[model samples]
Target chain A: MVLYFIGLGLYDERDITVKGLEIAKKCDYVFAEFYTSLMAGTTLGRIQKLIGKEIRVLSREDVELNFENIVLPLAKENDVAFLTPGDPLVATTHAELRIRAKRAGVESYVIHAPSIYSAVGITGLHIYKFGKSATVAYPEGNWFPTSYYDVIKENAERGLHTLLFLDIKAEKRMYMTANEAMELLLKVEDMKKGGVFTDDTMVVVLARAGSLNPTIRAGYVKDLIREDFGDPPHILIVPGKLHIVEAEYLVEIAGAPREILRVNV
Target chain B: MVLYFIGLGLYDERDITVKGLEIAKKCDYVFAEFYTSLMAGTTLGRIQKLIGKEIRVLSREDVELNFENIVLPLAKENDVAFLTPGDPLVATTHAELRIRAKRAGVESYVIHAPSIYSAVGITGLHIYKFGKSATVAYPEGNWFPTSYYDVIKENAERGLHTLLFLDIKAEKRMYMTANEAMELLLKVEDMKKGGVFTDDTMVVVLARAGSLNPTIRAGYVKDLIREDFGDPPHILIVPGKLHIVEAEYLVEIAGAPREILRVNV
Candidate 1:
């Protein structure tokens, strides 16, 4: 009779809220898709065990093209749950599926959870300072994506930090590393000569955010471009002009170069 | 030996993640502060009961001024849990507390949970499109803060959405409603005449986010300025250049005016 859009918070199965877990436990059917973002900390089997339900996994096509056909039919007769990584509909195209549900005579509700969007607060940048966000896509043959580069440029011009979501190839099980993202950005800078991203430019890298001891590093691209952040799921942030407190946290907590305390200001 | 900064999530006791709840239960001491944002859906007693501990509520002064005196002392010998509504450090000044823990020789970890920052996805706005968040602070006598009005103007100029976090004076139990925020913006508009916020400008109001039945309303200010959006902990968004899908979701899910499907595009 209803559809629940629950978010599997950043890392593991336990990251799901108690409310989502309890409601999912009572649901008649459960469906999940992980193509949008990877939950690198937990496995599919562990998620199912936590909810004590058999789960049906959907592909991007299934969700984007045929959500009404596959999910809404079951939602009409039973209390169904659709789970996704991070807060549901935060970055994904899933919000449009609510329109589909309306057409299919199915009711849908969203259950919130932790997302990397807000979890970047751990990087010591003020959440309010973040400007327009863009994803760094893995460039393929003859298909170079440089829009994310312009996003950082525009944000920096306004003295606002830019959050760059690194690309993910979920099926390939390949996650874009902060190293890769930095290398690509430097290449874009070389071609465009925008001075937006350079060896002197300081950036922050956060990996496995929901984990107790996730990697948090901040430094100039020259020093950190090759530095290891550890793990697949990584986020890169190009911070604009910094406040004194933001600089202090980057140095004290994220092991950023003390030079950033002086230079980034 | 350790201090854990955990988020109690957006709404009720059950909104806490299983990991946060388990860690909080095992902690020797528990503390919370609601000065940043209110959890309108639940009470202190309910949160204490769920965590199975006596939560020592702290005022903003207690935390900002005397954190090292109170929380860190207990954290030096025993595991201490510091809880806040929403994700631990998303928008709060609590991020600096990690530096305090470092100086005090106490280890700290952050447990993530739902926050209105990301939960705004329920309003059908793309999270990536959001830029440079601001707070709609209530005007105290002789103190008129209109910086938020400029923030909306800047973000809108870049074709980016602006997320406005409404004010909350937790001790006085004053939660600024969306109506108040709108009225303030209109007042700011009259003063600056930046054409940023006007009666004809479209806006979205989200109240009690993370609850199952959160109020999601979208329309022009002229139509929704007096429209009741229920209780507090409200967030107002002034979107810029809405995408077609965004407009459709606003129309279909949020009960936005059907004319937006054409006009906003």
Candidate 2:
């Protein structure tokens, strides 16, 4: 018996690869973990309908706590799959599960799919120039983690682009919008004296990526905060020093102001 | 009449999204850039046949030099698309073209698709832990650039994963394999006296990702160099400080030896 770790990719039900779909269909028990990120326009019911399979949804506690009692025993008997929102291994938890499965002598395979990182290639940013990616969680008690700000600042100093993944709460169906994430970054920048990010800093916001109504807009952080970007599952990019061509693309393609950008220098 | 930057994703013709395929069918002129990376088991002719359109192929020199004279004039006249392998914007050149198209008063949209970066999510590696990515270019005059080693060492010291994109000369049909890259890194480690990467350092190799027959293997550098990993477009991952769970996954899922890995220090 084999355990498959399947990634659902970015958008709706159809975004899943053929291989992943086949495995999901044939598996005796189909389980999914959705704590990290949720499928933008997809629900468990929708996925089940699309694939013609009954999937058991696993909560964060279910997999982390009841692995031995629930998941492992099932895997020991028949073929099972643990579905992840994006490519499954992006989070460390899934990797841990694969190891555990192996220890129990359960065969496993990872079925690859699309993810948010693929969005960078669509944005025309040099993939190699991106540094360590950081996430912005919801602000708690008027206090935010300034560590993300430092990482961005450090990447900018080195002329590297920063891929900022916005926060999402799949259980409540709540997502931290790009506007909100940008607002938080600005506040953090204000607190940090040597920070490179500011209101006028060129920022690229990608909303509803991999969906039919996906949006990609670039402008000053302040101006972007005011714009109405529809939907969730958004990503914010803080570009480092831009070459002339990159500056031109931001202004012309992504709707940034040409005058404010330094094209040649 | 809008310009769209479409990513063909990985592998063959069907990898493109329905939206991108629809756009290509209606577009007046379709141009594809193939310099960045090659399609796994398909050709430009095969893609054209799949989409039922004759795609105009553009050389790297053509896009970089003749954008204004060739691409811009056509883009202004009708709806056009600049097709690319594995998400267009991931490359710096495509970003420049979008900017040029926008400056010419041509509206542009980016259609997202999958890319090699998505492999990280499939491999069970933490996305946030990756540092700046470096490429291993083809050796020239008996010397490969040591700069890649520098990037690897820097990332290792900070406990960050270094993603090494093995160089490929698509036109010449030459690709640098992972085994070759591992051997090169070992030599670099010896020369620099860098304790970060030794002969026994753990590495992960992924070959032909986003394909049905993808190969993933993990092991010490010296052992991996001796193994035969088939095909082109191989990726080498130099992992930094591993969480015990990740190490376990590498051993169980990817066939790495648990004894060789230093887990959870």
DockQ of each: 0.90, 0.49
Clashing pairs in 2: A121-B90, A124-B89, A249-B99
- Candidate 1 runs further than 4 Å off: B263-265
lDDT by residue (tens digit), candidate 1, B159-188: 899999988888899999999999999999
Candidate by candidate, in order, the iRMS in Å equals 0.7, 2.7
lDDT of each: 0.92, 0.76
lDDT of 2 by residue, A78-181 (tens): 98888887678763466777667777888777766667886765555677778888888887786767788877887887777888888777778789988888
**Residue pair clashes in candidate 1:** none
Write one digit per residue (lDDT tens) for candidate 1, span A1-265: 9999999999999999999999899999999998888789999999999899999999999988888888999997899999999888886588888888988899898888898988999999999999999999877999998999999999999999999998888888888899999999999999999999999999999999999999999999999999888987989999999999999999999999889888998
What TM-score applies to chain A of candidate 2?
0.93
What's the distance in Å from true for residue B116, model 1?
0.6
Model 2 lDDT, residue A179, Cα: 87
